[PDB]
Structure 1
Amino acid sequence: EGQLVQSGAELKKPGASVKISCKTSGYRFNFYHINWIRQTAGRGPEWMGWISPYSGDKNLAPAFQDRVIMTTDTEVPVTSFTSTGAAYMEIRNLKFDDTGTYFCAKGLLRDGSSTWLPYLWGQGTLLTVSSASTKGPSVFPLAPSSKSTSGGTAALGCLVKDYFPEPVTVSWNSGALTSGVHTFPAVLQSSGLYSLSSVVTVPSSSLGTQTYICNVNHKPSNTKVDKRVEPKSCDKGLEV
């Protein structure tokens, strides 16, 4: 029942350093090794290294012997079988090849030939090594569109445009709407801009009984945009 949580998204410059957390729960933190593996589009995935919270024994890749430093706290036992530890990792000498999604995971077994093998993975943490600046997004509403004229389904969403740092998560009506929520990936402009959209398929009869507000939460820039999509349609297939 180990439900691990990593750190948040951060933006850094080349040659600087960044520290990523790896908070655990639901299992004995000192009973398993903690692996760390990255995923960069330049060289695919690469195993970075594992560490032992119990015996204090770490093991890195010879390419990460100088720039990666992994630390662990002592576990905080909640019950006789549950503890809440933490595993941090600092990486220095940031280059362009160290841009991607990083992971920490739980060791496999406590004894045998494959003990440290990663079984329970974290959700991940994306890092972008760039000398550019943090720029907030520009959030627009989307006009409703017909999806099935005979069925009567509308499609309305929000448009996040032109943000340089890490991507953004969006909720609907303070997270009260999950049915029909479909989120599109970001773009890559020639200047290095990222921009995406999100949409939801709403009933055409749901125009005087429900209200749809999209909530954009850009964390590296520490901004939030709450937009109200107008129920007035403009697609000729949707007014019916």
Structure 2
Amino acid sequence: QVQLQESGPGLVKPSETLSVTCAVSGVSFSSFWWGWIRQSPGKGLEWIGTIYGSSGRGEYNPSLKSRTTISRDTSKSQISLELTSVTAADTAIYYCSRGLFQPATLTSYWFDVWGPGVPVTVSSASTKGPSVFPLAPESTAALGCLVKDYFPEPVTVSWNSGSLTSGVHTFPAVLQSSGLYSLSSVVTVPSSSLGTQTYVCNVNHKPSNTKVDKRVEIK
């Protein structure tokens, strides 16, 4: 019955304010408690706070209260989260939730409905397209492309314009100390097909509007 959908900026610069919103549908907005939970890459889930639809009063995580505002837009049945003075550590998936509580004195909140989550990245990096470098060298051989120093995510990688799909692995991107991302895509092919057949990795980075096609061969 209840449906939650988050929306947000995607990218926030450090020291600015992170703003995300949650559209509540299917049920009475004023009858329940709504709040926010986040999960940072590599860290656990962290409750931010939860407010009553009817009054807007609520409770906040002490760790975050000084930077947090959770408010209602009743004309749209929305709740919003404002997080001020953000830093890279505020990079996270932000989830909208319904908070329930029970007579025990009351319990604190458990969360019976969650939104799908909105990823938000906090970074001072500027948009930059990737450099692409071939990865080149038994029955099977591995070939690949190193896609490095780009921002923001994501890049898409295909092989032979999509005509090579089996045996392809594209690794998760990693954030470098530079603030830029890097990943590799690899494919396994027959050792005997090398030298008589061409392998090309097609890289697309839409934020920078760059497409690179890299031929991967044995030096």
TM-score, normalised relative to structure 2: 0.65
Cα drift, residue 55 of structure 1: 5.6
Match 2:111 to one of 113, 118, 121: 118
Q: Deviations over 1:8-58 (max 9, x none)?
A: 4213132x3231234567x547375433134569x9754210134466443
Which residue does 1:233 correspond to in 2? Answer: 217
Q: Is the 8 A contact 1:185 1:196 kept in 2?
A: yes
SS in 2 for 1:234: coil
CA distance in structure 2 between the aligned counterparts of 1:70 and 1:178, rounded to whole angstroms? 45
Which residue does 1:69 correspond to in 2? Answer: 69
Q: Is the 8 A contact 1:35 1:118 kept in 2?
A: no
Which residue does 1:79 correspond to in 2? Answer: none
Instruction: State whether structure 2 residue 216 is matched by structure 1 residue 224.
Output: no
Q: Is the 8 A contact 1:50 1:60 kept in 2?
A: yes
Which residue does 1:82 correspond to in 2? Answer: none
Match 1:201 to one of 168, 187, 195: 187
Q: Deviations over 1:88-108 (max 9, x none)?
A: 21222x155853314223226
Which residue does 1:104 correspond to in 2? Answer: 95
Matches within 5 A, 1:155-166: 155-161=143-149, 163=151
Which residue does 2:170 correspond to in 1? Answer: 182
Residues 137 and 21 of structure 1: CA distance in aligned 2, closer, same or farther (over 3 Å): farther
Residues 208 and 133 of structure 1: CA distance in aligned 2, closer, same or farther (over 3 Å): closer
Q: Is the 8 A contact 1:141 1:228 kept in 2?
A: no
CA distance in structure 1 between the aligned counterparts of 2:188 and 2:39, rounded to whole angstroms? 36
Residues 12 and 97 of structure 1: CA distance in aligned 2, closer, same or farther (over 3 Å): closer
Aligned length, in residue pairs: 206
CA distance in structure 2 between the aligned counterparts of 1:32 and 1:157, rounded to whole angstroms? 51
Higher strand share: 2
When structure 1 is superposed on structure 2, of 180-189 and 112-121 the one drifting more is 112-121
Residues 24 and 170 of structure 1: CA distance in aligned 2, closer, same or farther (over 3 Å): farther
* Residue identity in the other structure for 2:184: S
Q: Is the 8 A contact 1:34 1:104 kept in 2?
A: no
CA distance in structure 2 between the aligned counterparts of 1:200 and 1:88, rounded to whole angstroms? 42
SS in 1 for 2:111: coil
* Residue identity in the other structure for 1:122: P
RMSD value, Cα? 4.4
Higher helix share: 2
Q: Unpaired segments of 5 or more residues in structure 1?
A: 77-84, 236-240
Residues 160 and 33 of structure 1: CA distance in aligned 2, closer, same or farther (over 3 Å): farther
SS in 2 for 1:107: strand
